[PDB]
Amino acid sequence: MIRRAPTTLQLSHDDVTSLIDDLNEQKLKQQLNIEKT
């Protein structure tokens, strides 16, 4: 028969936005710690 091209998962926008926000707060974490230290 004709094999149907298998579906491919896609990197969504929402999860990558979540990660970049998480990274932003991650770098914001020690910037005040450096000032504290």
């Binding site: 028969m1 004709i2 094999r3 149907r4 298998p6 579906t7």
Partner: protein, 213 residues
């Protein structure tokens, strides 16, 4: 009967009891010099097609097609295994020869549709799958290719009914049900797709498509 039983045994379905078909293949090959028979070769090609050993289709059915290029039984497997290999020149040559050989057969127009959809010209594949489906109603390949053209065109509402009607027309064939479940994935209704992936998996324990889906 000693040969007639094995010879009839060759032609059954290949999804279950696959090893026995292979033992019968060697049984025919030995003590009866029927290794050159076209039917044994076709059964071998279908064995390779099922486990998705596509290169083996290409080699074996090229060996036998040189001797006979218009064996209507053998051609659908060759078209499928060619499409999977994604080569357009050989398929173009075969389809264009078949069009001028058997104009009123559905096989040639199905081959033309496979060529166009290998070239990603879906609009013409629509018509050239419709013609093949009309020419032979009991040509499930044409129905599945038509629904594939619908899915690849961009719209899915009709392709939904396409895979539904394909499943209803051919009970006992797992592949249309699998494709229907894949479209259900495409439309994000997983509740139903669980059941059809289960019924498809009931008969196909080892193949990439089922496990991937």
């Amino acid at each position: 009967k000693e040969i007639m039983k094995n010879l009839y045994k060759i032609n059954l379905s290949k999804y279950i009891n696959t090893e026995d078909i292979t033992k019968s293949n060697e049984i025919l090959a030995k003590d009866y010099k029927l290794a050159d028979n076209v039917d044994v070769v076709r059964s071998k090609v279908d064995i390779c097609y099922t486990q998705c050993k596509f290169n083996e289709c290409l080699e074996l059915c090229e060996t036998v097609l040189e001797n006979d290029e218009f064996n209507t039984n053998i051609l659908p497997a060759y078209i499928g295994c060619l499409y999977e290999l994604s080569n357009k020149n050989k398929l173009f040559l075969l389809s264009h020869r078949l069009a001028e050989t058997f104009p009123k057969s559905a096989i040639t127009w199905f081959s033309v549709a496979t060529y166009y959809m290998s070239l990603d010209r879906i609009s013409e594949a629509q018509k050239y799958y419709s013609k093949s489906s009309i020419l032979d109603p009991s040509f499930a390949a044409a129905w599945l290719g038509f629904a594939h053209t619908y899915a690849l065109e961009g719209e899915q509402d009709q392709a939904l009914t396409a895979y539904s009607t394909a499943s209803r027309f051919f009970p006992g064939m797992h592949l249309p049900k699998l494709f229907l479940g894949m479209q259900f994935m495409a439309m994000n209704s997983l509740n139903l797709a669980e059941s059809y992936f289960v019924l498809a998996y009931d008969i196909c324990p080892n193949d990439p498509l089922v496990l991937n889906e």
